[PDB]
Amino acid sequence: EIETFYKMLTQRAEIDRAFEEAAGSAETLSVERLVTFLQHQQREEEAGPALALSLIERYEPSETAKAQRQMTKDGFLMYLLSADGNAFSLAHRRVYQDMDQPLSHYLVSSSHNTYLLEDQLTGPSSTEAYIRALCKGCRCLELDCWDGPNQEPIIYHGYTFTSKILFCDVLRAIRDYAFKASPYPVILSLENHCSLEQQRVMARHLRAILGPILLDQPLDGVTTSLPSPEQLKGKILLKGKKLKLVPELSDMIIYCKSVHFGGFSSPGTSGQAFYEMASFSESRALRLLQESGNGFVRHNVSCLSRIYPAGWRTDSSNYSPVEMWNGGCQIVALNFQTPGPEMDVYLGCFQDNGGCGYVLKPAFLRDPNTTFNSRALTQGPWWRPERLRVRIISGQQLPKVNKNKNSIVDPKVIVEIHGVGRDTGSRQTAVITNNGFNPRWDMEFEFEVTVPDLALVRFMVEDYDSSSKNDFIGQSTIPWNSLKQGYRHVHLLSKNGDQHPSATLFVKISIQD
Ligand SMILES: [Ca+2]
Ligand SMILES: [Ca+2]
Ligand SMILES: [Ca+2]
């Protein structure tokens, strides 16, 4: 019993099968067989005895097998549950991209009205809000500055009842957390409503608090393009109106001059200067993407564009970033405080490249001459259809949706494709009843993705409810090129982006041309 139970409760057939196929008759996996697994099934490209041997040295529990360069089923499972068995590429979980191109070539993690913790009309404001966003890797923050008592400028949502905080307090928080998550540059969007005196106080604080982190002069040689994330490493740069406005502030604006959208052009004309940044509401951006997709795209090659949520989103709800990234828009600001598929996709995108907050755009979106238009797809380097097969095998220890300690989840899995319009899809598995510990679906979906370079694959788990709305149990979003193949475990995150230590999905992912 105690053994026959212990094992059964802790037993995974799909794992057994997988080890069997890989190992066959043998009770162990020899390095040669592991390597075959790594290549045949996991499609590792660095697949070779070196990889295999590191896997064993890293994950093999048995001293005998370890020393004798073999992998036991136990070590097989350990590997599969590790960062190396993660569906989200371990290699991409460290900065690995070209960090030397101009800012306009990267998608940049950006926050909207960063100071807010809740809604846009009466909820609270707090430095905490800035701390959290920064800890989530956010690079672009927003400060809405108004005159406050005692000549101390405050921050809050103009014309609302949102609670207030101090501009100075905000600056210290930023100073303290700016680089905790990434070494790359932080951009502070100043929406100045301050009188002239308080503006001067602002400038004083900036200088005093930020000190040398503050970038108050052009980089030497930075002349025809924005500098690179590398060039601005460890800096904080200001975005705002540049000469109503005191010079103290105005002169601190270097590469991010707030500007009204002129139009897209081509030459050293209207389509703003590289050091000029235009903003667009969700609505306006969509329209422009709808009508001048390629113009916008091309514009974004050398220019930074900021998008922000529509005014009706007083609940701090978010729009989908993907639709904007597809246009090359880099500073796509979202309400970082609001849980949802939108932020899920957002942080999934930015977990890439070591979560540094700057993700290099695909080449075709860095080509000032592309004829790309996600909206009107034609032949080009971006067209590269892939057949993605995803098998949702089983789930392990799905978190209790917090809904009575005597109820058991009735989980189902939704798999979605996010990317250019034609590629978007969603599929769902059946519901397993009263099983969150080890539900088994063994269901497979297949998707055709034409522009993988702009896609993300999202796994969502829900607690099915007949009588009501299904509770969100966990989720994981993986950018196409970070999606690992073979047998892998998807590590589920909560609504707030937190890691769920033991909540996983075991899947098999195949990508083919
Ligand atoms: Ca704002
Ligand atoms: Ca139930
Ligand atoms: Ca239910």
From Swiss-Prot:
GO MF annotation: an example: calcium ion binding
Domain PI-PLC Y-box: 249-366
GO cellular component term of the entry, any: cytosol
Reactions accelerated catalytically: a 1,2-diacyl-sn-glycero-3-phospho-(1D-myo-inositol-4,5-bisphosphate) + H2O = 1D-myo-inositol 1,4,5-trisphosphate + a 1,2-diacyl-sn-glycerol + H(+); a 1,2-diacyl-sn-glycero-3-phospho-(1D-myo-inositol) + H2O = 1D-myo-inositol 1-phosphate + a 1,2-diacyl-sn-glycerol + H(+)
Effect annotated for changing residue 112 to A: Lowers activity 10000-fold
Keywords: Calcium, Glycoprotein, Hydrolase, Lipid degradation, Lipid metabolism, Metal-binding, Phosphoprotein, Repeat, Transducer
Mutagenesis or variant effect for residue 144 to A: Lowers activity 1000-fold
Domain C2: from-to ranges: 366-494
SUBUNIT field: Interacts with TGM2.
Protein name from the UniProt record: 1-phosphatidylinositol 4,5-bisphosphate phosphodiesterase delta-1
